[PDB]
Paper text:
A major factor that limits the expansion of shrimp cultures is, however, infectious diseases from viruses, such as P. vannamei nodavirus (PvNV) and M. rosenbergii nodavirus (MrNV), which have inflicted heavy economic losses. The Nodaviridae genome comprises two single-stranded positive-sense RNA that encode the capsid protein for viral capsid assembly, the RNA polymerase for RNA replication, and the B2 protein for host RNA interference suppressor. While the shell domains (S-domains) of PvNV and MrNV contain conserved sequences of 62% identity, the protrusion domains (P-domains) and N-arms show low sequence identities of only 17% and 43%, respectively. In this work, we have determined the cryo-EM structures of T = 3 and T = 1 PvNV-LPs at atomic resolution, the crystal structures of the P-domains of PvNV and MrNV (PvNVPd and MrNVPd), and the crystal structure of the S-domain of PvNV (ΔN-ARM-PvNVSd) in the T = 1 subviral particle (SVP).
To examine whether or not the shrimp nodavirus capsid proteins could assemble into distinct particles in the absence of N-ARM, the crystal structure of the truncated PvNVSd (ΔN-ARM-PvNVSd, residues 38–250) was determined at resolution 3.1 Å and showed a T = 1 SVP architecture. In the final atomic model, the ΔN-ARM-PvNVSd comprising residues 66–250, without the disordered N-terminal region (38–65), organizes into the prevalent jelly-roll β-barrel fold with adjacent eight antiparallel β-strands. The T = 1 ΔN-ARM-PvNVSd SVP contains 120 Ca2+ ions occupying the Ca2+-binding sites at the interface of each subunit, which are conserved with the T = 3 PvNV-LP. In support of the conclusion that N-ARM serves as a molecular switch to control particle sizes, the negative-staining EM image of the ΔN-ARM-PvNV SVP (residues 45–368) was also recorded. The EM image showed that the ΔN-ARM-PvNV indeed form a T = 1 capsid of diameter ~24 nm consistent with T = 1 PvNV-LP. In addition, our two PvNV capsid protein deletion mutants both assemble into T = 1 SVPs, suggesting that a deletion of the N-ARM seems sufficient to produce a T = 1 capsid. Our recombinant PvNV capsid proteins assembled in vitro into three PvNV-LP categories, i.e., T = 3 PvNV-LP, T = 1 PvNV-LP, T = 1 ΔN-ARM-PvNV SVP and T = 1 ΔN-ARM-PvNVSd SVP, with corresponding diameters 350, 240, and 190 Å, respectively.
Numbering used by the authors:
A (entry chain A), B (entry chain A), C (entry chain A), D (entry chain A), E (entry chain A), F (entry chain A): 66 to 250
Write the structure that this text describes.
């Protein structure tokens, strides 16, 4: 029972995309990041995660930081599904996807030229999750999955459509974990 | 963490069956009702269950109410298996099926012209269960399954065999739930 | 502010009906009794209700008492809608009607050869209602409407269909009211 | 009496409009959003609202978040009328419309490239409202209606008129409700 | 929540009428004054009432003051109906009209050459009412309606019938209000 | 003695002006707004002010909100003179006008693309002021006058002079008043 954190780690870059690149609701899913302790190869936290059998986030907050000037605009909504077998990749309505998104807890909505954060909501029971690579069922290994859904046109200084996908910011995880039972795995 | 109830909902009708219709022990299983918050389409509780990620019954009591006069008779035993992968559909002995039945906890045994109830026994650990349709494994989604086993001949005012299956009563659920984490699913 | 009761009054007879008489879900509505203080002409309570401007039930419990032997059977569900502009007269599914019924609060379900009761659930706010005949909108005058829905075949001593509608019991109201502001109306 | 929240839901997109599109004061009304628990189809809150007879917002705060860069500008005023039968769609003076707007309580005024919020002011009495679709009178069902009034020219990086309506941001509701009396409706 | 008062305002003149002018019970209704905060154009209170969404009288007392010498006589009864959809304009019996009148609460009866007062009885619930002009239903806007019923012949110094209608006094309102939620309307 | 507020009302639009339009120090006075309770026709507060003889602001804070993007710039100083017979319309030096401005109390200085506020400083004595239109002397009726002085060139994204006056934002009043003695005026 070893409590590590609070500490940070780098997740991914994030790319806003031009209207032309969004043909269906599923195309609005800019990132889909699994949030096991073990799902960020090269990171400190995933490095650690191979040395205990199980983990549980106490706090795991995804932090978006922009890389983009205030002369472009694009609205995201960001959220963490605690059920890794739910999947919005297959909803046929744009509005429905964004609704399902904001209705998660801790969801947050913002213009992509701005830093914002989203907490992982912790379970009511005290469930721990298996470290390491996924085996038969994700519900044993993934405490959550982080999503960014693009809700709005990527727009320019004059309100006109940007013609080309733009890598716009980065995701970082600010984390506090309990790890249980030393293993090497 | 939203505690809903106590409240009621309608499950199914129940049909006692004539000796002729019971050829094997499995034929004695008059109802097999899964008891997830999400397994009664059209009900209030299942309606609700799509708006939180997980659920746990605090109390979930199945209530049988008769629809049959006191000039017919038939003895049921009613019980809720907390393991949704156990399955008595395949026991070859009549006595064995009814034994396995009464030995569950909260089991109850009664003449079908009488109201009776059966509680779901809550887990010793504090396990929550996934709302919504079942995915890979039922043990993640079904907190229990409700059974009525017919133990006795459906008999008439004079002790003679009724010749024809008789829809004899109804099942209702009186429930108290915790729902955790708002989702739309 | 005059608190009258607890006291009783006679509402109506109730008639269970033969399978032949139930052609659509709406046909299952055996009684539809508005529950204003002023909606039972000839009764003591309605007599009183003309002498105050407004009323509010503190307790208003509908009591069914059978008039039928234990050699017939028929299952009712009884409930009081607090919204007098809701109307189930127009649901196309049998199951749906009974579900909507049991899901009301204080609903109760029983075999028609048995006395049972159903309370009116009081509002969370402290709303009073206008006495006397209805004017433009029922929501100003009807604190609730009482329903009996028949859920099951009217059946005989041997489990066979009764061929003819049967007046089976009676409804009584056991009431406690606040009446406000003396008027003659 | 079930207290749900605090939680979020997605209302609508919002479109600022070019001077050319604003010909009369009524044309300044960019959004007119009824705020019953039941008036946002597809949302979590409206999903819930079909399972209780009545509702009352404890807090219902409309949150505008921009989708527009800092090289355009346009001033809104946002407010929630608690009377759903008041209607400014028919005032003949521009100034008068905006005055009537800011004079509501909780009104707020801002440049559309900025996140801002507006609370629903709660009633002095403790009135609950009917869930579900509107029947005869809105005053029984709508606790309020949310408005955005555009007060200023949609202007570009150089102070010149934008020639074309611009979908500029989104509305979200951060809500806390009491729901009373379980119903299915 | 702004408590204004105690303060006064002028309602109307009142005209006693000669036997010849009273042909039916309805003709005895000398005044019929709605008592919303907003129903006295030109007054201070109605002036105010356009700047809050709703109102509720705490005290609203109608004060009759004579304008007539002690050599004429005529008996009034004065009362305030809290139900603005009740209407005595259509009772066929003289006695019945005056009875219905005195039986209101706070009713008062007097000779028209004398100052007298009548309070509005406040509701048992805490209902607020909509300010401004009436929309669909008066029960949302009128907290009450004030009546003067003439019960007796307008008579002269010698007990003989006055031949001609006589404007005999004036009505004033002494009021204390709560106004809720600033609006301009 | 009726304390109204805190509440808001709309004052005016404000127009920054191009270098060409500023020929003398007096031309820098972009707004000159008298702040009696009675000096904003159409507003809620001025509406109210006709129903008491006198008023005194407890707090009266002028709130500027921009309507202009961050690609233009212009520095204002905003202040409220408590002496309505002082008048800077006639100072011959630019620096002197702005000095006299910032030296008022509660004065505030800012770039016009930014929300800022300025309080009215309350008197050391407890002076009340006459409501309604001005009669012989302003010192009996105006508790203060609000000014915006432009201190800097209206400049573009590249530091070059904007050639044309630009309506740049709006003024709102957030107020708390005591009103004394009911009158109709
Ligand atoms: Ca392992
Ligand atoms: Ca799920
Ligand atoms: Ca009445
Ligand atoms: Ca309803
Ligand atoms: Ca109104
Ligand atoms: Ca004056």
């Amino acid at each position: 029972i070893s409590r590590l954190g609070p500490d940070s780690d780098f997740l991914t870059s994030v790319v806003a995309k031009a209207s032309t690149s969004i043909v269906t609701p599923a195309d609005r899913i800019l990132v889909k990041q699994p949030l096991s302790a073990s799902s960020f190869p090269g990171t400190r936290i995933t490095g650690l995660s191979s040395y205990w059998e199980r983990y549980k986030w106490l706090s795991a907050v995804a932090r978006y930081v922009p890389a983009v000037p205030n002369t472009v605009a694009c609205q995201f909504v960001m959220y963490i599904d605690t059920d890794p077998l739910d999947d919005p990749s297959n909803i046929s309505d744009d509005n429905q996807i964004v609704r399902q998104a904001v209705s998660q807890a801790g969801s947050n909505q913002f213009n992509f030229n701005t830093s914002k954060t989203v907490p992982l909501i912790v379970r009511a029971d005290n469930q721990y999750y298996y470290t390491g690579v996924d085996k038969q069922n994700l519900r044993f290994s993934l405490q959550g999955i982080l999503y960014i859904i693009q809700v709005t046109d990527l727009i320019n200084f004059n309100g006109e459509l940007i013609t080309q996908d733009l890598t716009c910011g980065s995701l970082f995880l600010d984390w506090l974990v309990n790890f249980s039972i030393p293993q090497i795995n």
